[PDB]
Structures are given as C-alpha cells and as structure tokens.
Design a protein around this ligand. Structure first.
Ligand SMILES: *[C@](=O)([C]([C][C][C][C][N])[N]C(=O)O[C][C])C1=NOC([C]C2=[C][C]=C(C(=O)[N][C]3[C]C4=C([C]3)[C]=[C][C]=[C]4)[C]=[C]2)=N1
Ligand SMILES: *[C@](=O)([C]([C][C][C][C][N])[N]C(=O)O[C][C])C1=NOC([C]C2=[C][C]=C(C(=O)[N][C]3[C]C4=C([C]3)[C]=[C][C]=[C]4)[C]=[C]2)=N1
Ligand SMILES: *[C@](=O)([C]([C][C][C][C][N])[N]C(=O)O[C][C])C1=NOC([C]C2=[C][C]=C(C(=O)[N][C]3[C]C4=C([C]3)[C]=[C][C]=[C]4)[C]=[C]2)=N1
Ligand SMILES: *[C@](=O)([C]([C][C][C][C][N])[N]C(=O)O[C][C])C1=NOC([C]C2=[C][C]=C(C(=O)[N][C]3[C]C4=C([C]3)[C]=[C][C]=[C]4)[C]=[C]2)=N1
Lengths: 243, 243, 243, 243
C-alpha cells in the first residue's frame, strides 16, 4: 500500500493473507473473507496454471504478518475460466477453506455489492494489504496491515490516462469494462496487495467494489491502479458461494 | 536460445541486436533487417509506452555480442497501434534507421513471406538470437549468436496445449490467430531473443514466418514458444516499408 | 544460529539487538547487557571506521525481532584501539546507553567471568542470536531469538583444525590467544549473531565467556566458530564499565 | 581498474587472467607471467583453503576477456605459508602451469625487481586488470584490459591516512612493511584486479613492484590501494622459480 498508514486492529476484519510453502509460509497476495468458508482473490495470484493446493494456505486477519500465524488449509481453488492475464481481464478467483471460520467482530465476512451498485466518483473507498509501500520498496517488518483512501475515477477517464505517453491506439481499450480504477500518485495499492480488497462505505455499509488486480507500476502519473469490478462477476461467484 | 548451438558466421545475415543506453549499450532484444533502412522487431521490446530514440541503437549481425560493436542510430519507432501486451496480440513494431545499410553477403535483408504463404505444421524452421540458454540461465560470454531448428505447430494445437494444466476455459483463446507457434521441451527461444526472427526455407528462399513474442517459460512441457505471425501483418508493414 | 531452537521467553535476559538506520531500524549484530548503561559487542560490528551515533540504536531482549520494538539511543561507541579486523584480534567494543536500563527478571545483565576463569574444553555453553540458520540462509520471520548448546574446544585444537585443508603454515597462528572457539558441523553461530554472547553456567552462575566474532562460514567441517575471549579483555572493559 | 583507459594491445604482455570453472570459465583475479612456466598472483585469490586444481585455468594476455580464450591448466598452486588474510599480510602465491608457454613480443614475462629496490614516491608505476571500474560497478562487456597510472606513496604516509576517521590506535600498524601503497581518489585498482601486477619503469625496464592485494573500497578518500611488496618475498619466489 502506497500512502495511507497502519490500520487500527478493529478495521478490515475480512482482510486475509495468502501463503505459499517455502523456507517459511511467505505472503504473496491478499484476499478477503466473503463467506465463513470462502475467500475471494485475484486469479493471477493462483493461476492461470494449476497449483498444488498443499503448497497453499490462508491466514485470517492479522495486525502483523507472520507474528500470530494460524494457517488454514485450502480444499479448492476456483479460477474464473475467462482468465489468462490481468490486462486481459476476469482477474478473479475463489478459495474454499477446509473448514468454516468462526466469525467475530475481529474476523468476519465483507458484504458483496448488489448487481446494480456502480460506485460513482467522489466515492470514499479504501484498499488494504501488506504489499510494497512504493515501487520496488517492501513493507518493512514488523509488516503492519496498511490502509489507504483512494479516489474512484470513471473507467473512461482511466482508459484515456493510460493512453497518455503510449503508442496504443486511442480506440484500443486498455482499462476494460469488467475493471474499475482508483488511486493517484500518492495513494495506491502495489505488488503484494494483489487479490486484496477495495471497499467503499455505501449507505453506511461496507461493500467490496473491487479486487486489487494490476497497474503500470504504483502511484505513477497517468497510471491509476486497476481492480477487477466485483459487480461484473457476481453471477459467477454466487455459482459457488451461497447467498 | 534453448538447445541450440553457435551459428556459423555465414548464416543469419539479417539478425540484429537492439541496444538500450546505460553503463554500456546493452542488448535487450533481437530483430531483423527487412529493408536497408528498416528493422522488424516485437512491439513489447519498445512499447507500449513511448521511448526516447536517443537511448536506442541497432547493431547488425555480430558473431559475438559487444565485441565488434558498430552501433547505428534509429530515426523512428513504429509500434502497431493495436498493441498493449504480448498475450493480447499485435506484438510487432518497425524501426527506421537513420541511414540505409550497405548490403553484402555477411549482412543483408531477410525476405518477408507472401500474404498466402501458410507455413504448415512440421516445417523445419529456425529461430536465432543471443537470449538465455534456459529459464533464468543467461547466455555466457563471449555471447555467441545462437540458432536452433524448431518445429512449427498448428495454431489450434498450441492453443490446446496451453490449456493443459490451466484454469482457462478450453473455449477461451490463449494462442490467438495473429500468433504462430513453434518449439518443444528441448528447442525454443528465450528471454533476450524477443523481437528476433523465426525463418523457414521455402522454395529455396528464407522467409520470416514469425517474430519471437512470448511464452510460459522456455521449452516447458506443453508450453511451445509463441511468435507473432508475420503474414498477418504484411499490409501494416507495407504501409511503411517499401516493397 | 545454526542447529538451534527458539529460546524460551525467560532465557537470555541480557541478549540485545543492534539496529542501524535505513528504510527501518534493521538488526545487524547482537550484543549483551553487562551493566544497566553498557552493552558489550564486537568491534567489527561498529568499526574500525568511526560511525555516526545518530544512526545507531539498541533493542533489549525481544522474543521476535521488530515485533515489540522500544529502541534505545546510544551515547558512545568504544572500540578497542587494537582492533582492525576480526582475524587479527581485539574484536570487542562497548556501547554506552544514554539512559540506564531498569532491570527485571525478564531484562537484566549477564555476569562477566573472573580473570582466572578458563572454561574447560567440553563445558556446555550456549550462544544466542537472530543470525542466519545456516550459510547464506536468513532467519525467517517472525524472527525468533534462537539458541544452541555448543561445545567449547581448546584453543590449540581449533587453531589446528583451521589449518586442515589450508595452505597456512602449521606454526602460523590463525586462532589467536585472545580468541576462544566452540561448535561443530551441527551447532554454530552465524552472520547476524556477531557481537552476541557465548555464555556458560559456572557453579549455578551464567558467565559470558565469549563474543561472537568470526569463522569460515557456519558449522563447516574443521571450521569451529571463533569468539573474542572476554577474560582476555576484562581490564579494558573495567576501564569503562564500573564494577 | 578505476580511472584508467583501455590498454594498447602491445602493452602489459605479462598480464594474466585467472579462471574458475562454473557455467563458463569466469575471471576472478589477475596474475602475471614471471617465467615461461610460472604465474605470480595474490594468495587470497586462491587461498587460504586448498583448492581443486581442476577447477582452475589460466588465460594469457588477451585484449578482451572471454573473446579469444585458450585456457591453460595448472599443475601446482603454491601459497605463502604465512598467509591467511590480505590485511595480515604475505598476500602472494604461485601457479605452476602444466607446460611452458612460448613467449613472444605480445606475450612474455615481467621482470622482478632486485632485492634492494624501494620504489620511491612519484616515479610512475601502472596497475592493470579487468576488475571493476569503480565501487560495485563491473567492467562492461567486451571487457577490455584497462591500465592506469597510480602515484606511489611511502608506507608510513598511507598508514596514517588509514588511521584517519578510524578507531584503530595510531601505533597499531595497518599498512604493513611487506606491503606497498599507490593510487588516489581518481586512480586505483578494484575488485577483480587482485593478484594483478603493479609495474614501474625504472632505468628503462619494467619491474613488478607489487601485487594488487586489498583496500577499503576503491579510490576512496584517505584509503589508497594496498599491494603486496614483491621485493619482500623475492627469496620465497626463487625457492620455486628459476632464473
Ligand atoms: C499484485 O500485488 C499487483 C497489483 C498492483 C496494484 C497497482 N495499484 N499486480 C501485478 O503485479 O500484476 C501483474 C499482472 C501482484 N503482486 O504479485 C503479483 C503476481 C504474482 C502472483 C502469484 C505469485 C506466487 O508466488 N504464487 C505462488 C502461490 C502458489 C504457487 C505460486 C504454487 C503452488 C501453490 C501456491 C507471485 C506473483 N501480483
Ligand atoms: C523475450 O525474449 C521473451 C520471449 C520468450 C520466448 C519463449 N519461447 N518474451 C517475453 O518475455 O514476453 C513477456 C510478455 C523478452 N525478453 O524480455 C522481454 C521483455 C522486455 C522488453 C523490453 C525491455 C527493455 O529493456 N526495453 C528498453 C527499450 C528502450 C527502453 C527500455 C527505454 C528507452 C529506449 C528504449 C526489457 C524486457 N521480452
Ligand atoms: C557476524 O554475525 C559474523 C559471525 C559469524 C560467526 C561464525 N560462527 N562475523 C563475520 O562475518 O565476521 C567477518 C570478519 C557478522 N555479520 O555481519 C558482520 C559484519 C558487519 C558489520 C557491521 C554492519 C553494519 O551494518 N554496521 C552499521 C553500524 C552503524 C553503521 C553501519 C553506520 C552508522 C551507525 C552505526 C554489518 C555487517 N559480522
Ligand atoms: C581483488 O581484486 C581486491 C583488490 C582491491 C584493490 C583496491 N585498490 N581485493 C579484495 O577485494 O580483497 C578483500 C579482502 C579481489 N577481488 O575479489 C577478491 C577476493 C576473491 C578471491 C577468490 C575468488 C574466487 O572465486 N576463487 C575461486 C578460484 C578457485 C576456487 C574459488 C575454487 C577451486 C579452484 C579455484 C573470488 C573473490 N579479491
């Protein structure tokens, strides 16, 4: 997370960390608890190639990575079939935990937005994760969970910005429809926050508007962060996660 | 190049090396001379964002990289407008040299295929360059130009193989129609060969069938090297390069 | 620490961690509290060249590095004047804290040995620290303080071992008289444990027999860990640290 | 070499490159031909630990490293028995080739100095090699042999400079008698140059005054390069090399 600060421990009770087996269970991506037994994340975090589930584990809300670990095994990795690369799209996936989690005020599910929700600009949204604090700059130990308020911008405004200083034809769409954008040169998600959640308080309730997907670098001029647009894939999600 | 051998001095007189400015004019991609003043390469080697021409140079056929440098300046970079990422497509670009090159037996242009040429699967073709000799395995000094005979494969077969061990739906195109594909687990192009040529001998004349584009690793199981089909973009090339 | 185990929270109340200013206060060496206002460490950790005090901090006993940080400024660095390199000798130094520390059962000084103590070869001693778990293998987060029982070995014997598989003449001393050694191919201290303590319990009292100094790799055959013999420099320490 | 330039092809016909087996025979140190069958280098290049001769080869004068390699096997590695680390001293060793090299105008031995030569300050000496052109930055390909004129300075003047900005006591000698120093903040040998020669034209003939041994960094303020003083080890050399 670029900009922002360490989040209070009472916030983002749905934030999760994905771990890959290695010299130690290292965090490679973020994710969110959308149901006691399911975790929503980015497809590029776990695919497009098939992974060995044994080498993967989930860590529920933690104020500091690795310090109070209670790794949870995974039984299924469901990746949207239209996915191949983040730039192309459909960068979304599901992880089914091996057991349901006991929810509480410190750890519970995030609410998904209704299919109608559009998240207009001037929309106070936040993004969180344990990713880099800048380009090629790791979150230093003790690895606190960070949060940052990011401005939502219209898809067409972002697509245009991405063509600035680029050879790509103006009519060749970069920021696609199943995508959503937010952030600026001071606030943005970065390597390590991927799969994590972008949430907005609407009508007094937190809804997950997006999933950290990609961007050209982090907080770079004319290159706002791109996120998978959750409302676009609700039907797919609900085909696995109970309503 | 993976699984190849050093190329004799008399072969591949069109192979060129692209240099970017830094502590020394370092090779970042390959290319091919298709006209005395034009170099054909891969768009991702120079795009999608616009580059400073002063930081770029072209080096004609060299038996060993860096040893006999005779860097040539570039006057114009033309990246196909439909390009954004190699996986999406249109990974082809043109480089216009400041001056036309004096052709000879050691250094001269390669012939472009005719719009109807259809390099069928099985046809022995060759790919060349100074790229890695294996995944994460750089080419050792003195950096000899390498070559390797790779078998071409039907577009649909390559696409199919890319779906094996992947979450991507079988109906979702991975190897697109503007791409060509060749190689196996023992022969393949690799990081550093990008923008380089894949040529085949047809009716006694060498034709460039492709441009090294992308691939999942190098010479990996069910992951043949993907190239930009030149026939697909002949009209775009002739909008600039004299026939 | 090689071949060790995480230390119980009630053990090694004198272990400290030295931090240097950068992206965060990173550990670079260990040390021991030998007096409320004094920390004993290795000269190569802070010398031979003079260092800016403002960029240095001390961290008292921590179960996990970076977790519960409460950094303490340093008022003075005293490096033995005879020190130039660890192989030459006199690898010992003193750190004076700006404020005296408030001891307790969880955080208190280690006892220095009397000038006659010898520490017989075979005397179970322990070495502690947050250094690597093996040659070129960092301690993985959450960075638990480690410990290992290492057997002390006679000075001549270690000097002898270092000659095995070496061109150095048998009469040329490698392990010198102001040094002590301990460990084997399974137990040793390693990069990051430097400046840390080597304690032995003599008649129900823990005495710091050594200071982690150097060695050829860690836990390598015939290359036992070398430490700065504390008894050898008691007079120098007492010229600064009160009784 | 720091602050020099490419050496003319006809100079330094005694320069040698030491190669270690690996993905390719890589250069790790320099050396000099002081006899048709012997190479003089630095002890720390091959010791203090005994090495497997097979993994070592020697390359004679070459304008560009790796370009025209004709690696010669080594039959014996003789390291001065008093050696353990460069700072301590006796940083000198001998390599006996498996066969005599045929000398010529382009490749011949360097002349060793008479036991009574002190090499006074001023008198021009040069140091050559394929090492870094500055701290932490390697010689760029095509790796040309570089040369540079370095001013020699009296041992005691350099010893004092090494004490500036350091804790080491003024009377604790750093630059030792069996050592010689040369260079400044703009001219010096660096990593990769070790074992190489420092030659001075005296009375119309080139004599090897020293061997690139060590230094605190390269071309750093008050830290001139240090070399093993050849005249000091003449008897030792002649114990193996004829006349
Ligand atoms: C993301 O953090 C970034 C988002 C940047 C936000 C801009 N505002 N996205 C990105 O880089 O996208 C490029 C298309 C991110 N960080 O790193 C990645 C890519 C990535 C995914 C997965 C791994 C990984 O190590 N996976 C493991 C997990 C696992 C494996 C491999 C094998 C078997 C079991 C489990 C590394 C990097 N995206
Ligand atoms: C290619 O070699 C590989 C091909 C693999 C074949 C497998 N069978 N393709 C690839 O990796 O594709 C990913 C989509 C290759 N190697 O490295 C790259 C990517 C790349 C492109 C360009 C640079 C680079 O340094 N460009 C310079 C040019 C320039 C710059 C930056 C600044 C100013 C002026 C000019 C690095 C890496 N593809
Ligand atoms: C030690 O851990 C090892 C011990 C190995 C035991 C074998 N059984 N010793 C070693 O490597 O010695 C070789 C002579 C160790 N690890 O790393 C070092 C060297 C070192 C010294 C100092 C720093 C450092 O970052 N210093 C800071 C302090 C400071 C600075 C620089 C600037 C301003 C203010 C304060 C890093 C590494 N020894
Ligand atoms: C020297 O170039 C420098 C000189 C600096 C001059 C400043 N004015 N010295 C130095 O860095 O000293 C540190 C005390 C140099 N560069 O690198 C080294 C150290 C070194 C020695 C040996 C190797 C090596 O790879 N050896 C091989 C050879 C061999 C091996 C290992 C195994 C089996 C057979 C043969 C690397 C680096 N000194």
């Amino acid at each position: 997370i670029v900009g922002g600060q360490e989040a209070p421990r009472s916030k983002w009770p749905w934030q999760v960390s994905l771990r890959v087996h290695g010299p130690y269970w290292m965090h490679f991506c973020g994710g969110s608890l959308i149901h006691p037994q399911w975790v929503l994340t980015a497809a590029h975090c776990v695919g497009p190639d098939v992974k060995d589930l044994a080498a993967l584990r989930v860590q529920l809300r933690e104020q500091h990575l690795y310090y109070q670990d209670q790794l949870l095994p995974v039984s299924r990795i469901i990746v949207h079939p239209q996915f191949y690369t983040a730039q192309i799209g459909a960068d979304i996936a599901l992880l089914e935990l091996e057991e349901p989690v006991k929810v509480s005020s410190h750890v519970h599910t995030v609410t998904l937005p209704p299919a109608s929700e559009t998240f207009p600009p001037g929309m106070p949204c936040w993004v969180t994760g344990w990713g880099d604090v800048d380009n090629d700059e790791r979150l230093p130990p003790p690895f606190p969970l960070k949060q940052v308020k990011v401005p939502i911008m219209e898809n067409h405004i972002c697509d245009a910005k991405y063509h600035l200083g680029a050879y790509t034809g103006d009519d060749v769409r970069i920021v696609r429809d199943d995508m959503l954008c937010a952030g600026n040169t001071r606030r943005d998600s970065c390597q390590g926050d991927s799969g994590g959640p972008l949430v907005c308080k609407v009508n007094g309730t937190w809804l997950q508007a997006g999933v950290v997907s990609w961007g050209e670098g982090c907080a770079q001029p004319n290159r706002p962060g791109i996120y998978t647009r959750v409302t676009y894939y609700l039907d797919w999600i609900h085909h696995y996660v109970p309503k």
